[PDB]
């Protein structure tokens, strides 16, 4: 009852996974060898074997060995089942077509066999949590190969998807716009709620709120995992107003294709400041509406809100939350659509946010994760399809994709389908 299968794809998805499973082990009190010293709260994320060993409901997939061989050697080598850490011989080379058509074509029927052996251990599986990069070759091409299979094999089950998405200025690859636009069919047709996240927005959150001047990816992944702990907390714990994984979607998603919420977390705070701020429910609610805390570089004030899920956790009371959202409804800069007069879905859970002991993010009595469907996110798509247009007007890297079995027309068919999504988010604001 209430299981989730977490699939971690490419380097970004696996490294976010290595932070997710670092957190879930602390939060459920599971040792890094999978044992538990001394309630079924762990059952959403861990299968339990008769030895008293808790084994994660996770699959890790990469087309090259390097990142998963590090998971197979570091402190979590004894946590995972050895055949659900899955590797190929050959890197996807930041090429969608190697991930989808040529290299991932070989590992896919082994990836599915592990997901089948995990689902057969569930009893009322709640959904899938799929972690990936939009810019990667494995991230875009292998996730889009896998999702097409899971959407015929498990058609009813909710597919939640956490995506590291290209930034306004920060980029690691020349072909990041091509891989991202080719992914837009995956999220539109074979996903149920897709959480876009941006490296440059978290880098700015780190600078302004944690006061860390120069963060690594370990600092980003420790924020991205904290949001998924808070999405899953109602599945795992007692609360005043627990939220089911489909109850979440029935309030987030107004229309079948309008399932790209923003996400934000509050308070992001260091130990230098957490002892001087009040961190009252009013303040951490208001922090979620600041452009300063959005984890995609777009401004919510250039949009309208369709719906917000305020998922509180720790020491909060429904009195305080209603009194808080009443001030948000009073502020004329936070504008909802005319057709959503209710606006807010509230969840409240009694389990505080767990600190990772090595981390920058401080101990606090309260947190909220706000997950928010808003028209503003269409600007993060308008940025990236303008990067695509400059390169496709030259066919600037297209021979690497055509050379690995892709149809040249798929680039036009993907830029077309993105323009129809960017149309849909502009159309519903009116």
């Amino acid at each position: 009852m209430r299981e989730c299968i977490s699939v971690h794809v490419g380097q970004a998805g696996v490294q976010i996974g290595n932070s997710c499973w670092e957190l879930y082990c602390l939060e459920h009190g599971l040792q890094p060898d999978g044992t538990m010293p001394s309630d079924s709260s762990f059952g959403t994320f861990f299968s339990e074997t008769g030895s008293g060993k808790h084994v994660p409901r996770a699959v890790f997939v990469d087309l090259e060995q390097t990142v998963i061989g590090e998971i197979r050697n570091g402190p979590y080598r004894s946590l995972f089942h050895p055949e659900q850490l899955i590797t190929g011989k050959e890197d996807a080379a930041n090429n969608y077509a190697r991930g989808h058509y040529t290299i991932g074509k070989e590992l896919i029927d082994s990836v599915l066999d592990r997901v089948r052996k995990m689902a057969d251990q569930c009893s009322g599986l709640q959904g899938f949590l799929v972690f990936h990069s939009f810019g990667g070759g494995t991230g875009s091409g292998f996730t889009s190969l896998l999702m097409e299979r899971l959407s015929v094999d498990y058609g009813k089950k909710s597919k939640l998807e956490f995506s590291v998405y290209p930034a306004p200025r920060i980029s690691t690859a020349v072909v990041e716009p091509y891989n991202s636009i080719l992914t837009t069919h995956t999220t539109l047709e074979h996903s149920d709620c897709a959480f876009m996240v941006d490296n440059e927005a978290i880098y700015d959150i780190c600078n302004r709120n944690l006061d860390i001047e120069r963060p690594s990816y370990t600092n980003l992944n420790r924020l991205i995992a904290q949001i998924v702990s808070s999405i899953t907390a109602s599945l795992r714990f007692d609360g005043a107003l627990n939220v089911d994984l489909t109850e979440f979607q029935t309030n987030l998603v107004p229309y079948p294709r309008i399932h790209f919420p923003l996400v934000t977390y509050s308070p992001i705070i260091s130990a230098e400041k957490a002892y001087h701020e009040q961190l009252s429910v009013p303040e951490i609610t208001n922090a979620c509406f600041e452009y300063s805390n959005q984890m995609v570089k777009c401004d919510p004030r250039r949009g309208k809100y369709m719906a917000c899920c305020l998922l509180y956790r720790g020491d909060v009371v429904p009195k305080d939350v209603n009194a808080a959202i009443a001030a948000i409804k009073t502020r004329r800069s936070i504008q909802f659509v005319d057709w959503c007069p209710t606006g807010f879905k509230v969840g409240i859970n009694y389990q505080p946010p767990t600190a990772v002991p090595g981390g920058d993010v401080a101990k606090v009595l309260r947190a909220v994760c706000m997950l928010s469907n808003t028209t503003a996110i269409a600007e993060a798509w308008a940025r990236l399809d303008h990067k695509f247009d400059l390169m496709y007007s030259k066919r600037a890297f297209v021979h690497w994709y055509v050379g690995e079995g892709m149809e040249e027309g798929e680039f036009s068919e993907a830029r077309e389908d993105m323009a129809a999504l960017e149309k849909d988010y502009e159309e519903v604001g009116t």
Binding site: A240, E247, T250, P318, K319, C340, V428
Partner: protein
């Protein structure tokens, strides 16, 4: 002897229900084990109204507990009184309602209702003379709104002459936790107007207004809201559980309270309510119970009665009190406030008087309003529904369960027909 069958649906219905069972077990002097430990013979005389006798003089409450998720059953079963209920009467699914009415009514609860209804039969066949069904639910979300109204339809078809009596927590704009709340409620009110004999309309905005502007609680929880609801649930059945100077069965309420068949959307209240630090300064007596009971801040729905007129009010008093003083105050109210009562009914107030006040107070009054001001509760849901529905927003989650767009059009049509019938007698 006038047994009631009680049914709990979804998170809210099981939470206001699991608090109600702590309140009436305190009244009837029943231990959390189910053993009787009370003071008085009057506590035991009518214990059959809400409980079954079992071996060793253990009492088992006649609740059915319904949910589409295990987690609220787990929260009730582990709770303050959870061990009291029959293990067979916890009827549940595994995958929830997703806050979707159509999952409740057509898919997830349509599977489960065959397993619910056959337990409602075992309890109703164990009754000596069943008077009715007492169902606790919410009209927001999907389990209480959509499965609870499926279950009302099934029990109504099977028991057409018994009282169907529902306690219905329902949406309002300033205290909301769901995006699709307006849809679920509009689909659900369409079932309540046809099937129930009484529906007690309750609102979280009004239950928070009692907690801040009367009780002066700094941080009211859902546990504090559930305590206000369950006081009025204990209140209206009092006259079949205890002796009195004027006895009123749930049917003796309905005959006096419902002038035209569909105008049965009531609005409850309770007195005395006092700020916790102020009780020693207050005189508990019938004219102070009256000046609280008939004031717009005390009622448990957002409707100010000064925006309509009452059709009927019932005041079910409890305690040792004068019939002259009760009959004097229920006259003085409707003559001094005559602009707030309909003038084609020659007396708008029903009274009842029980000899046994709640444990720890000398007197109490449960108030039931029927008023044309309840149009405002149905209007604001209907206008939130309309503003989403003109752009078909969120409908793929309901039409995915095989529901028609025509059923939304027909639900909002039947909602405006209920608004029009209250506005007609304004």
């Amino acid at each position: 002897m006038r047994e009631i069958v009680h049914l709990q649906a979804g998170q809210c219905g099981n939470q206001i229900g699991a608090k109600f069972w702590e309140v009436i077990s305190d009244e009837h002097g029943i231990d959390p084990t189910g053993a009787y430990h009370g003071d008085s013979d009057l506590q035991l005389e009518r214990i059959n109204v809400y409980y079954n006798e079992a071996t060793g003089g253990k009492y088992v409450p006649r609740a059915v507990l319904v949910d589409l998720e295990p987690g609220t059953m787990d929260s009730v079963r582990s709770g303050p009184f959870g061990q009291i209920f029959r293990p067979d009467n916890f009827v549940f699914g595994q995958s929830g309602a997703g806050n979707n009415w159509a999952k409740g009514h057509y898919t997830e609860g349509a599977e489960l209702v065959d397993s619910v209804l056959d337990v409602v039969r075992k309890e109703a066949e164990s009754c000596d003379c069943l008077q009715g069904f007492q169902l606790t639910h919410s009209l927001g979300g999907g389990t209480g709104s959509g499965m609870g109204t499926l279950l009302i339809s099934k029990i109504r078809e099977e028991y057409p002459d018994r009282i169907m009596n529902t306690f219905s927590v329902v949406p309002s704009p300033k205290v909301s936790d769901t995006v699709v709340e307006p849809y679920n409620a509009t689909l659900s009110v369409h079932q309540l107007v046809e099937n129930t004999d009484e529906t007690y309309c309750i609102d979280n905005e009004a239950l928070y207004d009692i907690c801040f502007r009367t009780l002066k609680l700094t941080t009211p929880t859902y546990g504090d809201l559930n305590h206000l609801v369950s006081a009025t649930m204990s209140g209206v059945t009092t006259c079949l559980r205890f002796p009195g100077q004027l006895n009123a069965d749930l049917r003796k309420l309905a005959v006096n309270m419902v002038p035209f068949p569909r105008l049965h959307f009531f609005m409850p209240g309770f007195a005395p309510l006092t700020s916790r630090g102020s009780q020693q300064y207050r005189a508990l007596t019938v004219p102070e119970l009256t000046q609280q009971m008939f004031d717009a801040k005390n009622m448990m729905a957002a409707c100010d009665p000064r925006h309509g007129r009452y059709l009927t009010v019932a005041a079910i008093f409890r305690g040792r009190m004068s019939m002259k003083e009760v009959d004097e105050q229920m006259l003085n109210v409707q003559n001094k406030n005559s602009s707030y009562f309909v003038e084609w009914i020659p007396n708008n107030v029903k009274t009842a008087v029980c000899d046994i006040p709640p444990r720890g107070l000398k007197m109490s009054a449960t108030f039931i309003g029927n008023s044309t001001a309840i149009q405002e509760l149905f209007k604001r849901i209907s206008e939130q529904f309309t503003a989403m529905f003109r752009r078909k927003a969120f409908l793929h989650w309901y039409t995915g369960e095989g529901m028609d767009e025509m059923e939304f059009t027909e639900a909002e049509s039947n909602m405006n027909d209920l608004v029009s019938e209250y506005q007609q007698y304004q």
